[PDB]
RNA sequence: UUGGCGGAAAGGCCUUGGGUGCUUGCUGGCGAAUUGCAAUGUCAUUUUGCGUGGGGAUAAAUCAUUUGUAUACGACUUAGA
RNA sequence: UGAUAUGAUGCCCUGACGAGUAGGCAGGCGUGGAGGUCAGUGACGAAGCCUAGACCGUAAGGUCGGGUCGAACGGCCUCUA
RNA sequence: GCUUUUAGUGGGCCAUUUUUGGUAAGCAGAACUGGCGAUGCGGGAUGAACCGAACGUAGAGUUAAGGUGCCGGAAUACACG
C-alpha cells in the first residue's frame, strides 16, 4: 500500500542508555554524554557502552518511514486528515492521543473513504 | 475493599482487616507467612499451639541474630520465635474472617487462608535520650494486616486451547506417507 | 578399605535392637524381623 | 493541528526501472554429468538412491529415471547441484526421452499417462541394465557414508 | 541398511577469535577426516546444518535447525570456517554438526 | 571416531598426554585414562621429587585447608596437570572436565575395552634414549600416596585374566586364519584380489 | 533355559539345549511416484506424572515430657505404652 | 528559475575526509510565560501519573495503545526568561 | 596573501640520542625529536609514555607488532647444531 522503498536498515536497534542508568534510580535512562576526565565511556574503552554519533544515522531514502513504509502524520480531525488525500502512498495518519471516541469513529470513516492508512485504528474503540 | 493481589473467587471468599495496629511489622509478617495457605482450623490450632510454646513461627526473612530452637525443625529452619502479640492479632483477624464466612454462607470445613498480607503502617514517634545530650527516635512500626479466606474447590479439568497446527508441504506429504505404509 | 558384606546373627537382644532406635517405646519393634527369615530356610543365604 | 504539514511532498509516481544488461545464457553443466550416468541423489524424498540420468531440461534441472521396477523413483526432476555424478554409465539411446519438458512436470492421484510413460521408458532402461552384472542390484541399493569414508579422497 | 548418513560429521570448535576478542559471526568447524587445507578445499561451500532439539513443538517438529555454509579453510590442519544465518550460540562449543554435500560438484 | 576413548597411560609423558587430552576434552571427546600409575616425567626422580616438594610448600598461610590442595595419587597428579591446561573456572571448562575419567590401574568396565596410545606423548618416541625419566607411581608413593601395593596386586590379577583371554582369542584367530586359508584360490577370492581386497 | 567365571567402581563375560523370526549364499514376481527441483524432514535416551492390571510388604522421625556422660542457643546423651 | 504542481535556505552530480581534554563555533531537543494562528484538542474525558506494549530520531527527545484520573491543554511562526 | 577579535593555557611528564651535579635513585637540571597529558584499538600476562597503528557506522579480503603444545585463534612444521 506504500511506495516501493529499499530494505530498512537501522544500524543500531539498541537504545543508547545512559552510563550508570541501571546503577542508580536518580540517573535516568535518557542519554547524557559523560564529561568526566577519568570516564572510560568518554574515553571509549573496550567492553563499555556505545555512544551516539553520526555514523549511526539512518539512510536518507528510508529515514522517518514506519515499517509499513509510510511517514506517520498526526491527525486531529477530518480537516487535517484530508491533507493526505493525494498522499496515501507516502504518509499514514495517526489519530492523536486526546481525540475522543465519538470523533475517532468519524475520522476512521473518512480515512477509509479516501483509503488513507491509519496506524492506530483500535484506539478507544467501544467493543 | 481494595485488598492485595487476589487470584481467588470473590463470591466464595471472606475477608478481614486491621489497620494501624500497634504490633511489630516484622513479627507479624513472619506469623502471616507462617500461616499463608493452611486450612483455617489447622491455622487456628497452630497459632494456639504457638501461644502454648508447642510449635514455633519460622522466622525466615526478618531473622538476623535471633536465637536458635528445636521447634523450627518441622520447618527446616534453625531460627524461630513465638511472637505472642502478633499471634493474638492474627488469630483475631482469623476469627473475624470466620465470622464473615459464616455470614456469607460459606462452609467452614473447607476454609483455607488464601491470601494474607501485612504492610507497614504510619509509625508512631517517641524520643530517646542518649549520651552527651542527644535525642534519637523511638518509633513503633505498626502494621496493616488483611486476609482473605476462601472455599477450596475441586478439579481444574480440561477444555482449553487446541493449538491448530500448520505444517508444510514436505511435512504433510510425510504424514500421509506413513499412514499409507502402515496403519 | 571397603565394606562389601555384613552378616548378623539370628537373635539380637533388646540391648542391641534398642541401639537402632531413637524412640524405642513408640515403635512396633520391627528391627531385623525380615532378616531372621534368612535363617528360616535352612541357613542358605547366610552361608552364601 | 496535531502536526503542521510537510512543506514538500514526495512524488507518488513510481520510477521506471533502468535498462539492465543481464542476458540469460544456457547453463553449462559440469563434465561429469553426461546423459546415461548413474547419479546419487543427495537430498529430498529419494535421498541416497542410485538413479539413471536421461535428459538435461531447459529449466536447468536433470530428468532422471530411478526405475520403479528397480528402486521406486519415477520420472523425476532433480537439481544438478544436489546430485553426485558417479562413473557408472548406462547407454540411453533407446529411450524416448525427447517428449518431456518443463511443461510436463507442471503441478497444476497419479495421472495415468505418467504411469504409462514411466513403464515405456522403463522397458528400454531395464533392457540396457540387464546386460551387465550387478548393475540392477547397485541401482536398487541406497547409498550411505560408512565409518571412515572420507568423500574428498573417495572416487565415486 | 543400518547406515543412513549422507553428510560428514563435524565439530563446532569455537568462534573466530583472537587471544582476547572473539567474533561470533564466524565459527570454526573441525570436519572429521580432514587433516590438510587441501583436503578441506573439497568442503568449501557445502552447507552446514546444526540440529538441536526443544521441548516445545513449533511447526510439527521438536527438532530445530540453524543453517549455514562453509566459507574458507583455517590453519594448516583442516579446520574450516563457517558463516550462518543465525550465529551458533556458543553453548555448542564441541557439539556435533552435519556437513552435507548435496551440491557435491561430484 | 570412538564415543569414549580409553587411553593406556603406561609409557606416556605427563604434559604431552595432558595437552592432547585437554584439547580432546574441549573438542567434545570423552576420555578415560587408565593405568595412571605408569606415567612418566622427563628428568630424573630426584628432580621431580624436588618439584613436588616445591609444590608441597605452597599453601595459604592463615588457613591451609583453603590452600592449594596437594593431591598425591598418580591419577590426580595427572588431573592437576590437565586441569591447568583447561580453563577450569568456566562452564565450558567444567563441562570439558566432566568428560574425563582418570584411574590408576585398569578397573571394571575399561578392562575389557580396547586401549589406545598417543604417539605424540610416548616416552619411547619423544625422549632421547638415555635421558633419565621418572615413573609416576614411585614418585607418588614417595610423596605420600598409599596404594601402590594394592594396585600392584590388582594389576597382576588383571594381567593373569587378560593373558588367559588372549590365549583363547589367539587360538580362535588361528582357527579363523586356517578357515580363511581354504577360501583362497577360488573364484571370489581372486576377484576380491582383483578389486584390492 | 543349562552351568560357569568376574568384588578394583564386580552389575558384565563365557557356555548348554530346544523353540520362534530374519537371511543379500543363489534365482525370481509384485509394490513404491505427488514430500512435486533442497529444506534434520522428525526414527536417540533422560526424568517425571497420571489413570488402568499383576505380584509384594504393612514403618519411623521430629516437637512436647525426661537424664546430665552434654550444653550460650541449637546440638549431644538417655528414658517414657 | 523556462513553465502549466509544491522545498533555489531546494533538488542533483562529483571527490576527499571523520580520534580528542581545556576551549571556540554551529545546527537542534526540552521547560515557565507573551503576541499571532490552526474558526486546534477536550467531561463522549484536558493535564498529570503508571506501563520488560508499539512507532520515529545518531541523540537531546517526539508519537501511539492500555490502565488511573478529573478541567483544562496543545501543533506551527515569532518574543521572553 | 591579509586583518580583526576572543577562549583556554602560563604546575607538566616520559622515551631514544647528546649532556651537567651526584656513589647512585622511579634523583635534580638542560639540548633535539617523538610521544603521554588529550588517546581509544592489536601486542608487551598485567602497566599513561615501549612496539604496531591513531578511531564515523558496517561487510568482505590482507597484514603490522606479536605469535602457532594446551589454556588460546594459528605447524607436537621442516633443517643444522
UniProtKB/Swiss-Prot annotation, chain C:
Q: Additional comments on file? A: Present with 450 molecules/cell in log phase SD medium.
Q: What is this protein called?
A: Large ribosomal subunit protein uL3
Q: Which family does it belong to?
A: Belongs to the universal ribosomal protein uL3 family.
**Which residues are recorded as modified (Phosphothreonine)?**
5
What is this protein for, i.e. what is its function? Component of the ribosome, a large ribonucleoprotein complex responsible for the synthesis of proteins in the cell. The small ribosomal subunit (SSU) binds messenger RNAs (mRNAs) and translates the encoded message by selecting cognate aminoacyl-transfer RNA (tRNA) molecules. The large subunit (LSU) contains the ribosomal catalytic site termed the peptidyl transferase center (PTC), which catalyzes the formation of peptide bonds, thereby polymerizing the amino acids delivered by tRNAs into a polypeptide chain.
List the disulfide bonds in this chain. Answer: none
Q: Oligomeric state and partners?
A: Component of the large ribosomal subunit (LSU). Mature yeast ribosomes consist of a small (40S) and a large (60S) subunit. The 40S small subunit contains 1 molecule of ribosomal RNA (18S rRNA) and 33 different proteins (encoded by 57 genes). The large 60S subunit contains 3 rRNA molecules (25S, 5.8S and 5S rRNA) and 46 different proteins (encoded by 81 genes). uL3 forms together with ES39L one of the contact sites for the signal recognition particle that targets ribosomes to the endoplasmic reticulum membrane.
Cellular location of this protein? Cytoplasm
Enter cross-link residues for Glycyl lysine isopeptide (Lys-Gly) (interchain with G-Cter in ubiquitin): 38
From Swiss-Prot, chain D:
- Tell me how the protein is altered or processed after translation: N-terminally acetylated by acetyltransferase NatA.
Q: Does the keyword Ribonucleoprotein apply?
A: yes
Molecular functions per Gene Ontology: RNA binding; structural constituent of ribosome
Q: Where in the cell is it found?
A: Cytoplasm
**Keyword vocabulary terms for this entry:** Acetylation, Cytoplasm, Isopeptide bond, Phosphoprotein, Ribonucleoprotein, Ribosomal protein, Ubl conjugation
Q: Where primarily located?
A: cytoplasm
> How does this polypeptide assemble, per the annotation?
Component of the large ribosomal subunit (LSU). Mature yeast ribosomes consist of a small (40S) and a large (60S) subunit. The 40S small subunit contains 1 molecule of ribosomal RNA (18S rRNA) and 33 different proteins (encoded by 57 genes). The large 60S subunit contains 3 rRNA molecules (25S, 5.8S and 5S rRNA) and 46 different proteins (encoded by 81 genes).
Q: What is this protein called?
A: Large ribosomal subunit protein eL6A
Organism, as annotated: Saccharomyces cerevisiae (strain ATCC 204508 / S288c) (Baker's yeast)
UniProtKB/Swiss-Prot annotation, chain E:
- Subcellular localization(s) per the UniProt record: Cytoplasm
Q: Which residues carry this modification: N-acetylalanine?
A: 1
Q: Where is this cross-link: Glycyl lysine isopeptide (Lys-Gly) (interchain with G-Cter in ubiquitin)?
A: 46
How is this protein annotated for GO cellular component? Answer: cytosol; cytosolic large ribosomal subunit
What keywords appear on the UniProt entry? Answer: Acetylation, Cytoplasm, Isopeptide bond, Ribonucleoprotein, Ribosomal protein, Ubl conjugation
Its GO biological process terms?
cytoplasmic translation; ribosomal large subunit assembly; ribosomal large subunit biogenesis; rRNA processing
Q: Name one Pfam family in it.
A: Ribosomal_L35Ae
Task: Identify the domain of life.
Answer: Eukaryota
InterPro entries hit by this protein: Ribosomal_eL33, Ribosomal_eL33_CS, Ribosomal_eL33_sf, Transl_B-barrel_sf
Could you describe the post-translational modifications of this protein? N-terminally acetylated by acetyltransferase NatA.
- Which Gene3D superfamilies does this UniProt record tie to the protein? translation elongation factor selb, chain A, domain 4 (2.40.10.190)
Entry-linked HAMAP family: Ribosomal_eL33
Q: Kindly state the subunit structure of this protein.
A: Component of the large ribosomal subunit (LSU). Mature yeast ribosomes consist of a small (40S) and a large (60S) subunit. The 40S small subunit contains 1 molecule of ribosomal RNA (18S rRNA) and 33 different proteins (encoded by 57 genes). The large 60S subunit contains 3 rRNA molecules (25S, 5.8S and 5S rRNA) and 46 different proteins (encoded by 81 genes).
What is noted besides the main data?
Answer: There are 2 genes for eL33 in yeast.
Name of protein: Large ribosomal subunit protein eL33A
Q: What is the originating organism of this protein?
A: Saccharomyces cerevisiae (strain ATCC 204508 / S288c)
Please name the gene that encodes this protein: RPL33A
Swiss-Prot record, chain F:
Q: Tell me where the signal peptide lies.
A: none
One matching Pfam family is: Ribosomal_L13
Tell me the GO BP annotations in alphabetical order: cytoplasmic translation; maturation of LSU-rRNA; negative regulation of translation
| CDD domains, alphabetized | Ribosomal_L13
Which residues form the Glycyl lysine isopeptide (Lys-Gly) (interchain with G-Cter in ubiquitin) crosslink?
175
Q: Can you provide one Gene Ontology molecular function annotated for this UniProt record?
A: structural constituent of ribosome
Sorted UniProt keywords: Acetylation, Cytoplasm, Isopeptide bond, Ribonucleoprotein, Ribosomal protein, Ubl conjugation
- The yes or no answer to whether the keyword Cell inner membrane is present is no
What is a single cellular component term in the Gene Ontology annotation? cytosolic large ribosomal subunit
Could you tell me the superkingdom of the organism this chain comes from? Eukaryota
Primary subcellular site in the record, as a coarse category: cytoplasm
Q: Which InterPro entries match?
A: Ribosomal_uL13, Ribosomal_uL13_CS, Ribosomal_uL13_euk/arc, Ribosomal_uL13_sf
The UniProt PTM text for this protein says: N-terminally acetylated by acetyltransferase NatA.
Intracellular or extracellular location(s):
Cytoplasm
The record's section on HAMAP family has: Ribosomal_uL13
Further facts: Present with 43300 molecules/cell in log phase SD medium. There are 2 genes for uL13 in yeast.
Name the family the entry cites.
Belongs to the universal ribosomal protein uL13 family.
Query: What is the name attached to this protein's record?
Result: Large ribosomal subunit protein uL13A
Source species? Saccharomyces cerevisiae (strain ATCC 204508 / S288c)
Q: What's the encoding gene here?
A: RPL16A
